[PDB]
Amino acid sequence: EFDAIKIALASPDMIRSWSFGEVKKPETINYRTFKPERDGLFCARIFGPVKDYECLCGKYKRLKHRGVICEKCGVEVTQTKVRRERMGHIELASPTAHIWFLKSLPSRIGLLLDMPLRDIERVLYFESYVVIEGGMTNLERQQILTEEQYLDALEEFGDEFDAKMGAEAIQALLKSMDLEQECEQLREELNETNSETKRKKLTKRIKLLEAFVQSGNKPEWMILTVLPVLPPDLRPLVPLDGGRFATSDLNDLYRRVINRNNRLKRLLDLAAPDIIVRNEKRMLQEAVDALLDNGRRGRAITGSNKRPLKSLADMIKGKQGRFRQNLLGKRVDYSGRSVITVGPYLRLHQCGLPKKMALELFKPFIYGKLELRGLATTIKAAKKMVEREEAVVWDILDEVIREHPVLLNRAPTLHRLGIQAFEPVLIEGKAIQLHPLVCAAYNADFDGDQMAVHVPLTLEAQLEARALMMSTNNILSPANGEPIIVPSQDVVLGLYYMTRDCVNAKGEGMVLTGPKEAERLYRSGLASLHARVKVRITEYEKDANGELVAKTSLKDTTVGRAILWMIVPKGLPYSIVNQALGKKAISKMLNTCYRILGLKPTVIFADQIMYTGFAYAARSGASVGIDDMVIPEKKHEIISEAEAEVAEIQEQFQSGLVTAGERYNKVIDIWAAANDRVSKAMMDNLQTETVINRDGQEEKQVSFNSIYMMADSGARGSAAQIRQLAGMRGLMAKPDGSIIETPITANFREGLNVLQYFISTHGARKGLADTALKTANSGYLTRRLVDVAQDLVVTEDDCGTHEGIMMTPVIEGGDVKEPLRDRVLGRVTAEDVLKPGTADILVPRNTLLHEQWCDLLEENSVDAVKVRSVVSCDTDFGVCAHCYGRDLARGHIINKGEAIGVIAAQSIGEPGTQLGLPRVADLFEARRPKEPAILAEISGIVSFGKETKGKRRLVITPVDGSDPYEEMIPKWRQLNVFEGERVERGDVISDGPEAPHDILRLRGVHAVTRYIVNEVQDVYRLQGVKINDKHIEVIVRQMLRKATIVNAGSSDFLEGEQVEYSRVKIANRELEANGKVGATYSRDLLGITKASLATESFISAASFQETTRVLTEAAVAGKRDELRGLKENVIVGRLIPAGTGYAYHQDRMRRRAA
Amino acid sequence: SAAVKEFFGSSQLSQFMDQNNPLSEITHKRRISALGPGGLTRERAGFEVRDVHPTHYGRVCPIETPEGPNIGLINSLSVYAQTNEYGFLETPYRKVTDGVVTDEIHYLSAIEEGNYVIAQANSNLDEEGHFVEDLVTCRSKGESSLFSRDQVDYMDVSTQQVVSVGASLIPFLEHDDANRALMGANMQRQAVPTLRAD
Amino acid sequence: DKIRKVLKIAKEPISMETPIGDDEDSHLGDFIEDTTLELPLDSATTESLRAATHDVLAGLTAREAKVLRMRFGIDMNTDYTLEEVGKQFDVTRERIRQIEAKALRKLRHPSRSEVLRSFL
Amino acid sequence: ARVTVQDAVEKIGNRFDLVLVAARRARQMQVGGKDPLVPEENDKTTVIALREIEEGLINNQILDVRERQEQQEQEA
Amino acid sequence: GQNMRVAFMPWNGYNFEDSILVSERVVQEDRFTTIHIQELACVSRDTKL
Amino acid sequence: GVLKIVKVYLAVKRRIQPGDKMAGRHGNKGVISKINPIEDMPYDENGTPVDIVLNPLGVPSRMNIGQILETHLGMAAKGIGDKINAMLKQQQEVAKLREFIQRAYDLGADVRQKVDLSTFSDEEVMRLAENLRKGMPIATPVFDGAKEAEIKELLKLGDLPTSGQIRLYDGRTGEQFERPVTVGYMYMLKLNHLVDDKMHARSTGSYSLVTQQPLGGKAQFGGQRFGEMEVWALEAYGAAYTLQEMLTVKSDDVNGRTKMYKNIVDGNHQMEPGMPESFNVLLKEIRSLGINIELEDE
DNA sequence: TCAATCAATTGTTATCTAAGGAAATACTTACATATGGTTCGTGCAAACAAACGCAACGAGG
DNA sequence: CCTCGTTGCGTTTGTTTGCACGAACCATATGTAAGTATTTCCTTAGATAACAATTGATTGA
Ligand SMILES: [Mg+2]
Ligand SMILES: [Zn+2]
Ligand SMILES: [Zn+2]
């Protein structure tokens, strides 16, 4: 229907064209019969009827008379919905400046006229005069007088003198100026001037003038002579119960404007003295400012209460404005919410939905089925049946939801898996039942959490829920490739308990005919669940494609592992169940099943694992008692020895040998040593102390202590918590940071005394407050990341670029922090990868490195592999699928259309609460460090020049090239290199943290992307989080989206114009058809906030950050937003160009370019 | 009348009484808030004001506080805490002579608490007022240490005096992590009266 | 009684941006519904009633059905009067009155208006 | 019955064209203009369309060919 | 509240993350039953019609 | 204006169900998931089922050990009552009840509390015993509580094991659970978070005034906010029709939602999305400033 | 001996997601006159409503 | 086939509705005050960080 959205200035003629009449009075309602007043803010003639097809007076109350205007009242008869579209206008008796274009900082009115905003505000508030082409004899045009000077020149000059006051003077200046001649003169000044501050001012002024004269805008339109009026239904005056009315603040602001305008008209009619008229014009200006913004004028005007009135601008900007509260998110029909319970019987693809919830959510479907199956004659009858809940309504409801998925969503949707589709199974209750394996994805527990259910209505939405969002399709993380439906705590405990072996167990040694014999032996009580036995077992191997060769062998295992082996699918080795099966083992086993067998066997295996683990954790009778927290017998000895050392060192301090701080540090060290000793003794006493005998003297086996088994299996707890339970809970640091010299020696099995508990609360509250105040900034970071990368989609299949990045294992300090396998898994090689000896082509050029190629590389010990990256792709407006890689949510290459920018933002952002995080915020904002690194700007020989107060001028001279670049380096910066040396480009001269801008400028795009990915990955790795580098590289590519034209040459650009890099790329592509190019650029690097705010679309940039600035710039420049983005289409309610709508959008282009 | 009604009806510090419990009522009535007209705001309070202070000992509960936007701003009064004539919280202590723990109670304010060394409630007495141990654990100025029997001026009146009424209804509190004790007190403020009180 | 009217006279309207006790994001305007809206069930019922009247008037003699469609504004312009219908049928007004009474009687038959009475 | 769509995604690919083609075909069945091509098992038209895709009986190419031939035979 | 005979054990995933498994005797004895009086006001006003 | 007010007071009775939040005093939250038949519950040698089953994995990660202690002592307390109960079911004597109750109040360590039953008249001792037949209340002050050895001694006074764990049997199968489990008495609370007051659904209802969108939660029968992050999740999927219907026909398109309701009524699950009304409001609001914003290529 | 370039001050903009809670209350011009709108009861013609009489029709005999 | 019961049509008598029309009673809008009288308040708190612009001092030419 509409292709783009155009924004520009509004002329008085345009504002009148919108208008359907002039709001002449401030009246709204008649206070006795509440009908609208004749020419007021709620007027039937101007804005339309208040009842459907009913004339206000009462002479026309039928649809038949539609299309006529009455005579006793002059009210058109039509629908009432037109009240939401009809606008009015107010004819101001005095021009008033638009506050946005006067108080934008920079002020468009001030910059256009080259007049300081101070002078303009002085003239506007009738404090000083301004000459207006007032004769080219004694006073210049832009000169400003005062009362003294104006009166002086009055008798001295009658004619050829024009000095006016207020906004009429500003309008006269803005209308008398001609843009082309001013642009020409300023171009001459710019070309014949050498000063960077004045140069920059001239560039800014020229850009405003050119973007103004190119568009249809006229400067005088920045002074409002006609004021548009919002439709009444958008500023309602509705009745509240009890004879009270609820009104919008816009009514009050408009009433003030109308009152003051009418008073000004009256005063000018009376020919009142200039002082009174000037005061009234000041008041009218203030009223218009308040209506538009209710700020930028010192004091906002408050209403009947003491709260400032909400202005026209306040209803668009902010977290509560239209853009973010009603256009990017919404309240939605066909939705419910309830508490979540567990329901461990469910299959992975289904959820328990309460019958009443389903009955309410599917009401139209039920009405349709009732009518179709003949059980209700009319829709009202079907409604009555559904209200009465007759027996057959439930049968209809069962038929309706048979294969209708529903979307389950938990409140903080940190990533994709926060919404998942499930098949409903109707439950006689009121709490939604959630499969235990999706709780980790939801980050959901069952201590009072709630979930929202949404019904997909159309066939497309239902098929999308089934084929994209179904919980069975989402079993791998989209951040890393790791599985996300791994069994969590009770399942892990059950499998761990059933798989580990005892030393002398009932039924040990006997030889079994298979897993069925093992299960029969255990369930009949003749053998212990974990008794070391031999058993005939039949593995299946899928060496080649398809064929599953069977290998039967006598394995030495336990009864429990043999029992578990029946759950495993065919093409998996038996060794996966011949270990103790902790949390890590089960996750690796599910990953192996997915990578060998596929998706369906993995889903079945996950369900069976959950069922078996629950069953055997139940049978285990695992419990927690006070005896299960065993304290080391040496704890008393250790604390006594540490206290004796403390007393000794305290005496030494009292002997005048060591300062109090050093004594405190020594005490801290010895107490930490004692804490480590206690913890080690506790773990030794609790992990393997269990001693028993097998037909002999004695043996040793791992402990069956319940707490220990929970910690070791990975079900719940960790060595830190276990030591806090049995051993001392270490030293406490007061929230300042100082470690309390006296450490808490009591654990929790024994009590904490009052002092220790007070000290513990010191840090407990600090942690709670920190986590309460952390997710805010992490959410802000995720919002910025999503806004920068929202318009990134896999548009092509292969760009054909050869450029890539070299991935090597990260080593720091002689140890590997992350191997090459996990860095190069799923990325397409950019250039052919040879063996270290150059023997032959190990892997072809453009192969997607799955785990087989990665295994080959590991076997042949290849250290560096050059793989394609999103940051080096050649695709315009998107990226090919071969530069992205594997689509870590699936195993196959990324599909065409996937919104990889949103996925990258969510993957980077959802772990931010585990974080530190301000370091990542700094990296993505590309902030320059406080004391940066002075890198070598150019290659050459270095020398020193003047070294006076104007700090040392360093000169680097190339062998042949010119060397006008000299750096003003401080003396208090320690030079890394000597005075008489030679330095290469992008080298280090001083010492300090390297700013990302300088890394990009001197070393390159690969250098800066490597810097960013390595630093942020260092943060996340330190904190234990796993994120693929695809996502960080996506964010970096979005940060590198602009370029400055160092030499326009024969292109159609300026010099300092910061163009979008894709535009200059296509321009340099096209100009290769010709001969002349002369177009050279320097890539810029902006922060995510700065990169996303400086984007082609003005709607997507106004929608998230400061809206006044973006809207004013787009209005003065006359920007035209072709949607071509996810945010833009989400706002206008169209199919986003990302997923199943991508094709649709492409088709639209097919029809648009014809 | 308008001023009085505006205060008592529509003001931040006058709120609907939590009435789903005896404990909820009692712990609402003795509730301290740093917000309201004349105090901070939950949006821009700052961590330092939210944090537990060593002067909170015996005057403001360390754990009974809401977790969320206003944590450390809605503290609750401790069991024995009082208020000066001037409005400063004071807590009781039993006076210690040379070595005898007398039964006379002095209410010490926060600024007066530093100037003496105060023994702990978990300190022993040999049936006549004298400390069994010659070195007793005390707190003088923010920190705690060991002091000679003939050094202390005051002793804690009871071992319950650091907690609020709700926190002091948790058996085996000393065995519970401070986060979970905070949660437990907050939760037992919300228990619904059942058909028969057991 | 004038005293009661003067006291009832509406006080100053409440701002629709009035915070609710939470004072965070709940404003008065968040609790006010559009009273002049057609519920989807009502609109669907209107459509079904139009269809039912069509399918019921279909089962009437030609002139009786036309008379009934004219006397009420059934899928046409303003309703006609009996005199106008005579002006178009060229018959006496009382004749059209009798015709419409008989048509309504026939439409009152059971097994002919059970769905129509279900519409009540 | 339906649990996962991996054979239909395999047979069509792109995981997005599958949704569009399945929606086209399910709407064809839903409106009284077409009949299932696989034995109905009490399934909804969406699942029936997916099961037809898995069998290979429905593609985006098959659907447009059938639409074209229906148009051509409409001339009669 | 009520003092209840509690056992600490997994029991089949019906107390998985923090879920609680309750016996029917607890419901039969109505020992976690509560009474919830509530007001509902019908106000008749003076409308224009 | 108001002529007459009639207030009706209703008295509901909320029993218990899955979804209701329970809690102990030690920060151990929990939502009821299943209500079990009495013959499915674990039971001990005497055939007495446990009322509640709590996950032991909740305890170690969050160091709230008090509950475990509270359980042990709880058992001990009930144990004393059980003994008293027996001595009251058979009319043993005043002397035996007095002796056992007196022994139960002494319990070893030097506690500041003294109870002398000698001053209790026979009639008063019987009243005390009748009040103690449901269990013996025990006070465990905040930081001056009951030591673990005292808990074991009280467990010994009753005939309960001092380990705090008994062997339990599966009601489903009658098989003995391995690895004895911790059973006792814990004080559970019913929190004011009833699933009766929290379940909520909506197909269509009232709509907001300026923006033609559903309203708030469960008091205006309003819908669920499909906020911006949910939109991001839909965008990360390919779900473009889901997203479009979510933000056009389910929320804001005035003409679209009525057509969708009708189309669903006759089993045609197709939508005519249209332009959401809130974007129209935004256009009229930007135009109400002196800014001309329009749609191109009409 | 002026002005291009640092440096401190001022002003603008930003700070997680959902569910519950309902809003309040000071702050007084009066007496007279012209006019005009609104409410109310009426009349007149039009528009329905009842109950027949006559004639045509079409079934019965 | 003749004759008698049912229906189409017009007629006569009787009743409710739709407009238009005074009449009167209150509602609104507007005017007129002649000891003097002469520049306002009031409000509000314990953020924090980042980023530009603007204004002021230092320094290269
Ligand atoms: Mg929770
Ligand atoms: Zn009219
Ligand atoms: Zn590429």
UniProtKB/Swiss-Prot annotation, chain C:
Disulphides: none
Superkingdom assignment: Bacteria
Marked site (Interaction with anti-sigma factors) residue numbers: 71
Subcellular location(s) of the protein: Cytoplasm
Stretches the record annotates as Interaction with anti-sigma factors: 93-108
DNA bind region: 82-101
Region entry Sigma-70 factor domain-4, spans: 56-109
Subunit comment: Interacts transiently with the RNA polymerase catalytic core formed by RpoA, RpoB, RpoC and RpoZ (2 alpha, 1 beta, 1 beta' and 1 omega subunit) to form the RNA polymerase holoenzyme that can initiate transcription. Identified in a complex containing RpoD, the RNA polymerase subunits RpoA, RpoB and RpoZ, CRP and DNA. Interacts with Rsd; this prevents interaction with the RNA polymerase catalytic core and with promoter DNA, and as a consequence, promotes transcription from promoters that require alternative sigma factors. (Microbial infection) Interacts with Escherichia phage lambda antitermination protein Q.
Function: Sigma factors are initiation factors that promote the attachment of RNA polymerase to specific initiation sites and are then released. This sigma factor is the primary sigma factor during exponential growth. Preferentially transcribes genes associated with fast growth, such as ribosomal operons, other protein-synthesis related genes, rRNA- and tRNA-encoding genes and prfB.
Family: Belongs to the sigma-70 factor family. RpoD/SigA subfamily.
Stated name of the protein: RNA polymerase sigma factor RpoD
UniProtKB/Swiss-Prot annotation, chain D:
EC code: 2.7.7.6
Assembly behavior: The RNAP catalytic core consists of 2 alpha, 1 beta, 1 beta' and 1 omega subunit. When a sigma factor is associated with the core the holoenzyme is formed, which can initiate transcription. The rRNA transcription and antitermination complex (rrnTAC) consists of RNAP, NusA, NusB, NusE (rpsJ), NusG, SubB, ribosomal protein S4, DNA and precursor rRNA; S4 is more flexible than other subunits.
Function: Promotes RNA polymerase (RNAP) assembly. Latches the N- and C-terminal regions of the beta' subunit thereby facilitating its interaction with the beta and alpha subunits.
UniProt-recorded Gene Ontology molecular function terms: bacterial-type RNA polymerase core enzyme binding; DNA binding; DNA-directed RNA polymerase activity
GO BP annotation list: bacterial-type flagellum assembly; bacterial-type flagellum-dependent cell motility; cell motility; cellular response to cell envelope stress; DNA-templated transcription initiation; intracellular iron ion homeostasis; nitrate assimilation; protein-containing complex assembly
Record field: catalytic activity: RNA(n) + a ribonucleoside 5'-triphosphate = RNA(n+1) + diphosphate
UniProt enzyme class: transferase
Protein family: Belongs to the RNA polymerase subunit omega family.
Protein's recorded name: DNA-directed RNA polymerase subunit omega
Keywords: DNA-directed RNA polymerase, Nucleotidyltransferase, Transcription, Transferase
Residues of the full protein shown: 2 to 77 of 91
Record gene name: rpoZ
Organism encoding this protein: Escherichia coli (strain K12)
Record bears the keyword ATP-binding: no
Swiss-Prot record, chain E:
Coiled-coil parts of chain: none
Residues of the full protein shown: 797 to 845 of 1342
Technological use: Co-administration of salinamide and rifampicin or salinamide and myxopyronin suppresses the emergence of resistance to both antibiotics.
Superkingdom classification of source: Bacteria
Family stated for the protein in its record: Belongs to the RNA polymerase beta chain family.
Summary of subunit composition and partner proteins: The RNAP catalytic core consists of 2 alpha, 1 beta, 1 beta' and 1 omega subunit. When a sigma factor is associated with the core the holoenzyme is formed, which can initiate transcription. The rRNA transcription and antitermination complex (rrnTAC) consists of RNAP, NusA, NusB, NusE (rpsJ), NusG, SubB, ribosomal protein S4, DNA and precursor rRNA; S4 is more flexible than other subunits. In pull-down experiments interacts with CedA. (Microbial infection) Interacts (via flap domain) with Escherichia phage lambda antitermination protein Q; this interaction renders bacterial RNAP resistant to transcription pausing and allows it to read through termination signals.
Post-translational modification: Acetylated on several lysine residues in the presence of glucose.
Protein name: DNA-directed RNA polymerase subunit beta
Function, in words: DNA-dependent RNA polymerase (RNAP) catalyzes the transcription of DNA into RNA using the four ribonucleoside triphosphates as substrates.
UniProtKB/Swiss-Prot annotation, chain F:
GO MF, one example: ribonucleoside binding
PTM annotation: Acetylated on several lysine residues in the presence of glucose.
GO terms of biological process kind: bacterial-type flagellum assembly; bacterial-type flagellum-dependent cell motility; cell motility; cellular response to cell envelope stress; DNA-templated transcription initiation; intracellular iron ion homeostasis; nitrate assimilation; regulation of DNA-templated transcription elongation
Residue stretches spanning the membrane: none
Gene Ontology annotations for the cellular component aspect, listed alphabetically: cytoplasm; cytosol; cytosolic DNA-directed RNA polymerase complex; membrane; transcription elongation factor complex
Biotechnology: Co-administration of salinamide and rifampicin or salinamide and myxopyronin suppresses the emergence of resistance to both antibiotics.
Keyword Acetylation set for record: yes
Similarity-based family: Belongs to the RNA polymerase beta chain family.
Record's protein name: DNA-directed RNA polymerase subunit beta
Organism: Escherichia coli (strain K12)
